[PDB]
């Protein structure tokens, strides 16, 4: 039961935490192929290839690297669900490609940026921090 208020996402290449973040997400998926024949009760299935994606939301920032990331950029992202405390697992994705960014605001609220990423050529690797 990680606390979830201490999560840190950092760009591995430039070594900077992203900024005041509202939320993070990650997903991993593998496609399915099903086949059945005449006279068969159940359908057999197998998994072929894998992709991963995710998104993070942060208050709009002109004083942090939050500002720098751009659609099309290739970045290395290390995400710490429970923080960087020793023995806390980190999900590291290499070659993350940033597909899209979205900025929004309202009269009564703080401006927000949402970044969506996909993985290219690699799959997220779990590891445990020192």
């Amino acid at each position: 039961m990680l606390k979830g208020k201490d999560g840190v996402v950092k760009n591995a290449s430039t070594g900077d935490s992203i900024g005041h973040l509202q939320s993070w997400a990650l997903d991993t998926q593998r496609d399915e192929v099903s086949g059945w024949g005449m006279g068969d009760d159940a359908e057999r299935a197998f998994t072929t290839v894998g992709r991963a994606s995710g998104n993070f939301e942060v208050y709009l920032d002109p004083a942090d690297p939050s500002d720098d990331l751009e659609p099309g950029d290739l970045v290395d992202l290390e995400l710490y669900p429970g923080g960087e405390s020793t023995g806390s697992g980190y999900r590291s994705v290499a070659g993350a490609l940033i597909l899209s960014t979205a900025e929004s605001a309202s009269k009564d609220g703080i401006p927000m940026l949402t970044v969506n990423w996909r993985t290219s050529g690699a799959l997220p690797q779990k590891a445990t921090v020192s």
Binding site: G4, K5, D6, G7, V8, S17, H20, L21, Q22, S23
Partner: protein, 140 residues
């Protein structure tokens, strides 16, 4: 930071020509006929960001007690409680809800939460006016 906001208020409300005393229990004077008092009141709260921050919902209450010519600065019939209280209040509202950034910044929103005029029967008639202003302040 109540002290700072109160200090801003202290500067912002000291302009009417009369002393402002806040939270003096023993004091209940009639000599200071025009009366002003500003209270920072309470702060409720919620988290900010992931990794740290806090914000508060806060109420600032301004109260005015007055008699006689203090009401009658210019226009006629300020003895009428409503006109008199409104006359002092609107300018007070502009004082606190002023354009200067420092006053506005620690305060964020400065909306008038409530307004009131009240009547107490003294030889000289005394009337109480309340001007709640809601300010949301980031907890330091």
């Amino acid at each position: 930071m109540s002290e700072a906001i109160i200090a801003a208020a202290r500067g912002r409300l000291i302009s009417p020509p009369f002393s402002d005393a806040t939270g003096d229990v023993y004091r209940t004077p009639e000599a200071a006929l025009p009366a002003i008092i500003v209270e920072l009141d309470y702060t409720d709260a919620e988290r900010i960001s992931m990794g740290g921050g806090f914000i508060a919902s806060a109420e600032l209450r301004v109260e005015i007690l007055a008699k006689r010519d203090d009401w009658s600065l210019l226009t006629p019939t300020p003895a009428n409680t409503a006109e008199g209280m409104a006359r002092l209040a609107a300018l007070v509202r502009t004082a606190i809800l002023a354009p200067p950034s420092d006053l506005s910044g620690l305060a964020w929103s400065i909306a008038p939460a409530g307004y009131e005029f009240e009547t107490e029967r003294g030889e000289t008639p005394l009337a109480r006016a309340t001007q709640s202003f809601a300010l949301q302040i980031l907890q330091p």
